[PDB]
Design a protein around this nucleic acid. Structure first.
Ligand SMILES: [Mg+2]
Ligand SMILES: [Mg+2]
Lengths: 318, 99, 90, 37, 88
RNA sequence: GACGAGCUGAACGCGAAUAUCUCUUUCGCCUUUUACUAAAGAGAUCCGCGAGUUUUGCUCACGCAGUCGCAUCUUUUUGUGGGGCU
RNA sequence: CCGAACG
C-alpha cells in the first residue's frame, strides 16, 4: 500500500532517534554515511548506525557540560566535540576513548569546524570573542584571533587558509590565518547584510559559497570567491524562525549543493531548493526548536536534531 | 635497557671470530647473554674470486641458542618481528502534524 | 633468584635434557646436562664431541667451564619457559 | 552596534550563555539533601 | 664508581666514531651507554676490516670489545667533566 | 614511572543477626471461622548490609616531588696478543 | 501446655 518510491535502505522513510536525555544541539553524519554523531545537552555523544538497526552502539562521555557542536574528522574514525564546559575534545570513534582534550578557551566553546583538506586542524570560536585555530599534533593552539564580541559560528574554508566567524556583532568576518601570525590581526572580509546575530555557518561543497543562518530569521548566501562583486551577498531565504531560545541554529548544504536545510525554532525542519530560493520541504514532527539538520553524504536523506531530545532520520520524496 | 625495545625483534650477531648468528630475540641478561629463537650460523668463507660475497656464506641451522656476552661484540637489527551498546533506540514513527 | 637474569634459569630448567654446547674453540658437545652453575659451568652426560676437524668422539661425562663456552643449543620444547610466555605480548 | 548597543547586546548574550549552562543548571545536577530543622 | 664510564653514559645523542678490538670502524650517534660501557648507537654506518661500509638505522656494541671512542671536536668537555666527582 | 570523609543516587550481590506472612499438605487444639500448635515442602516480605564513579555538600589537601625518555685479581664489563699452512 | 473475638 501507498508504495511511494523508497529512496534509501532505511527500514522506514521517517526514523526518530531517541535515547538522549537532553537537548540535542548538533549532529553529524560520518563521511562514509553509516554513522551518526549526536551531541546532546546532557554532555554526551551518541553514536548511531544509519542502517539496519539504528543502534546507538556507543555513548561517549567526558564533557562536563552540553556538547554544543560535533563534526567528524575527514576519515570518520576521529571525532571533534565542542562544548559549554570550555573544552573541545578529540575522540576515537570505534574505541570509546578520548584522544586529545584542549581547553584553552575561557568561556563556552560554541562553534567548531574541522578542516576537510590538509592536516588534522579545526577552528573553534567561543564566547571570549576569540576564534582559535587548533592543529592536532601540537598541544598548544596554533592560532588565536580576537574579535570583540562572543563568537557564535565558525567554519574552515574548503581550501584551508581562511576562517569564517560570525556572531552577535551584526557582521560575519573572514580572516586569513597565514596573513596573521600576530595576536591582533584585523579582519579581511566583512560580509554585512544580516540584521542581527549569526548562528550557523556551512561551507559549500565547491567552497565558493558560505551559508549563514541568522536570528535575523534569514538565511543568507554569500560568495567567498576572492573576485566577487562589491556585495558578496547572493541569496536570501525566508521561512524559518528564531525565538527567545537563541539556540545554536545551524546551516547545511545537501551533499550536492541542490538543497539547503536549516534548523528553526518553530520546530520545523526547513529544506529550500537553493536555485529558486524557495521551500521544498517543511517537515513537522519535532517538539523542540530544531538545532541542526544534516544531509546524508550519499543519499538525499535528511536527519534533524531538536531541543526535544530526539533526532528524526528520514528520506525526501518528490 | 633499550634492548627491551628489542625482544621479539629479529637480530644479527657478530662473534669475535667473526662468525654470524641470525635469530629472533627472547630474553637478555645483564652479562649480555641473549636468547636467540630460530638461530642460524652464517660463517664467512674466504671470497674465491669470480663469485659474489653474498651468495656462498656457509649457513648452518643452530635452532634455539643462547649467547654469552664475553664473545658478543656487535648486534644489529635484521628485520621486523616475524608474524558497548548505549541507551539508544530507533523506532519508526510518523511525523505529527498541527492543523 | 633475586639478582639473577632469565637465561641462566632457562639453562637450569633445561636440566635433564640433551643439549648442544659450542665453546669459543669451535668444537661441539652434545649431551644430557646434569646441572649448571651461575658461572655457566655445566655437567653433561652421554657426550658427543665434535672436534674442529670433524672428529666424533664418545665421552661418558663432561664438565664444561662456562667462560670457555660460546653458546648453547636448547630444545624449542623448553622455549616454552614461563619467562618466554609471560613476557610475550599476547 | 558601535558599542552604543553592541555592548549590551553582547553582554546579554554573554550572561544568557552563562545562565543556560550553569552548574545549578547542568544535567547531572542533584539538589543538596535536606538539612535539619 | 669510575670517572670515565660516568663520563661516557652522558654521551647520549652524541654523533661519534668507535674503533673495535679487531679493527672495525663505526660512525654513528650514541643513543645510550650504560655502566658496562655497552653502547646502542643510532644513525650508524659500520665498516668491517677490509670491508665495504654498510649503514644501520641502529646498532648495538659490547662495552668490552670496544677499542675506543672518537668524540666530537665540538665537545664542551669541561661541561660534562663537572659532576663526575658527584655521587648521586 | 603518583593522593577521601558524609548523603542521595549506582547497577550488580547475601562474615552474623531473624522476625513475619502466603500457598500445598499432614498433625494437634476442636462446635464453626478467625486466632493458634508442630511437621513436611513450596513461596514471599520485612529490617538491614559490600564494592566499584555520580557527584551534590569538605569543613582537608598538595607538585625540582617520593620515581624520570650491580662500577678494577683464577667464573663473567677490563677478553692472549702475533704469524701462518689448505 | 498456657488466650482473645464471633457465632
Ligand atoms: Mg454460621
Ligand atoms: Mg446467628
Amino acid at each position: 500500500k501507498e508504495g511511494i518510491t523508497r529512496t534509501s535502505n532505511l527500514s522506514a522513510p521517517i526514523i526518530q532517534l531517541s535515547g538522549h536525555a537532553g537537548e540535542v544541539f548538533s549532529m553529524r553524519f560520518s563521511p562514509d554515511g553509516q554513522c551518526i554523531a549526536s551531541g546532546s545537552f546532557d554532555k554526551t555523544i551518541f553514536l548511531w548506525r544509519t542502517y539496519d538497526e539504528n543502534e546507538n552502539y556507543n555513548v561517549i562521555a567526558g564533557h562536563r557540560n552540553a556538547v554544543l557542536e560535533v563534526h567528524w574528522f575527514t576519515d570518520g574514525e576521529a571525532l571533534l566535540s565542542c562544548s559549554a564546559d570550555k573544552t573541545a575534545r578529540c575522540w576515537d570513534a570505534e574505541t570509546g576513548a578520548p584522544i586529545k582534550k584542549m581547553g584553552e578557551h575561557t568561556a563556552v566553546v560554541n562553534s567548531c569546524c574541522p578542516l576537510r583538506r590538509g592536516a588534522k586542524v579545526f577552528v573553534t570560536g567561543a564566547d571570549d570573542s576569540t576564534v582559535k585555530v587548533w592543529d592536532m599534533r601540537v598541544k598548544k593552539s596554533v592560532h588565536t584571533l580576537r574579535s570583540e564580541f562572543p563568537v557564535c559560528a565558525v567554519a574552515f574554508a574548503d581550501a584551508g587558509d581562511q576562517v569564517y566567524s560570525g556572531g552577535v556583532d551584526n557582521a560575519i568576518k573572514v580572516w586569513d590565518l597565514r596573513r596573521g601570525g600576530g595576536a591582533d590581526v584585523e579582519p579581511s572580509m566583512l560580509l554585512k547584510g544580516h540584521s542581527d546575530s549569526v548562528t550557523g555557518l556551512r561551507v559549500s561543497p565547491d567552497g565558493g559559497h558560505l551559508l549563514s543562518n541568522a536570528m535575523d530569521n534569514t538565511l543568507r548566501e554569500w560568495d567567498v570567491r576572492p573576485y566577487a562583486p562589491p556585495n558578496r551577498c547572493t541569496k536570501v531565504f525566508t521561512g524559518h524562525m528564531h525565538n527567545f531560545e537563541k539556540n545554536l541554529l545551524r546551516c547545511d548544504y545537501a551533499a550536492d549543493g541542490s538543497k539547503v536545510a536549516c534548523g528553526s525554532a518553530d520546530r520545523m525542519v526547513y529544506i529550500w531548493d537553493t536555485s529558486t530560493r524557495k521551500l521544498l520541504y517543511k517537515l513537522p514532527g519535532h517538539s523542540g526548536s530544531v538545532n541542526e539538520v544534516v544531509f546524508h553524504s550519499k543519499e538525499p536523506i535528511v536527519a534533524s536534531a531538536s531541543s526535544d531530545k530526539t533526532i528524526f532520520l528520514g528520506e525526501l520524496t518528490q | 635497557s633499550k634492548l627491551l625495545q628489542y625482544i621479539n625483534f629479529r637480530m644479527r650477531v657478530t662473534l669475535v671470530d667473526s662468525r654470524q648468528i641470525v635469530g629472533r630475540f627472547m630474553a637478555f641478561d645483564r652479562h649480555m647473554n641473549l636468547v636467540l629463537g630460530d638461530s642460524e650460523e652464517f660463517r664467512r668463507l674466504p671470497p674465491k674470486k669470480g663469485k659474489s660475497e653474498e651468495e656462498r656464506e656457509e649457513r648452518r641451522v643452530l635452532g634455539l641458542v643462547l649467547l654469552r656476552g664475553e664473545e658478543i661484540v656487535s648486534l644489529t637489527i635484521e628485520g621486523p618481528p616475524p608474524n558497548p551498546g548505549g541507551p539508544g533506540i530507533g523506532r519508526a514513527v510518523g511525523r505529527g502534524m498541527p492543523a | 633468584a633475586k639478582g639473577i637474569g632469565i637465561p641462566v634459569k632457562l639453562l637450569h630448567e633445561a636440566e635433564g635434557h640433551v643439549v648442544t654446547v659450542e665453546l669459543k674453540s669451535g668444537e661441539m658437545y652434545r649431551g644430557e646436562l646434569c646441572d649448571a652453575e651461575d658461572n655457566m659451568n655445566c655437567q653433561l652426560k652421554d657426550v658427543t664431541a665434535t672436534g674442529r676437524d670433524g672428529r666424533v668422539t664418545q665421552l661418558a661425562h663432561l664438565f664444561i667451564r662456562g667462560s670457555r663456552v660460546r653458546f648453547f643449543i636448547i630444545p624449542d620444547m623448553l622455549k616454552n619457559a614461563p619467562m618466554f610466555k609471560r613476557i610475550d605480548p599476547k | 552596534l558601535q558599542q552604543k548597543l553592541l555592548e549590551e547586546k553582547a553582554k546579554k548574550w554573554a550572561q544568557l550563555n552563562a545562565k543556560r549552562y550553569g552548574d545549578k543548571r547542568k544535567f547531572g545536577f542533584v539538589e543538596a539533601p535536606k538539612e535539619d530543622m | 664508581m669510575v670517572k670515565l664510564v660516568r663520563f661516557l653514559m652522558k654521551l647520549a645523542n652524541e654523533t661519534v666514531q668507535i674503533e673495535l678490538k679487531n679493527g672495525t670502524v663505526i660512525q654513528g650517534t650514541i643513543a645510550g651507554v650504560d655502566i658496562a660501557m655497552n653502547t646502542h648507537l643510532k644513525a650508524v654506518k659500520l665498516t668491517a676490516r677490509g670491508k665495504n661500509p654498510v649503514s644501520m638505522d641502529h646498532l648495538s656494541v659490547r662495552g668490552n670489545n670496544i677499542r675506543y671512542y672518537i668524540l666530537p671536536d665540538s665537545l664542551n668537555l669541561d661541561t660534562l667533566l663537572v659532576d663526575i666527582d658527584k655521587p648521586k
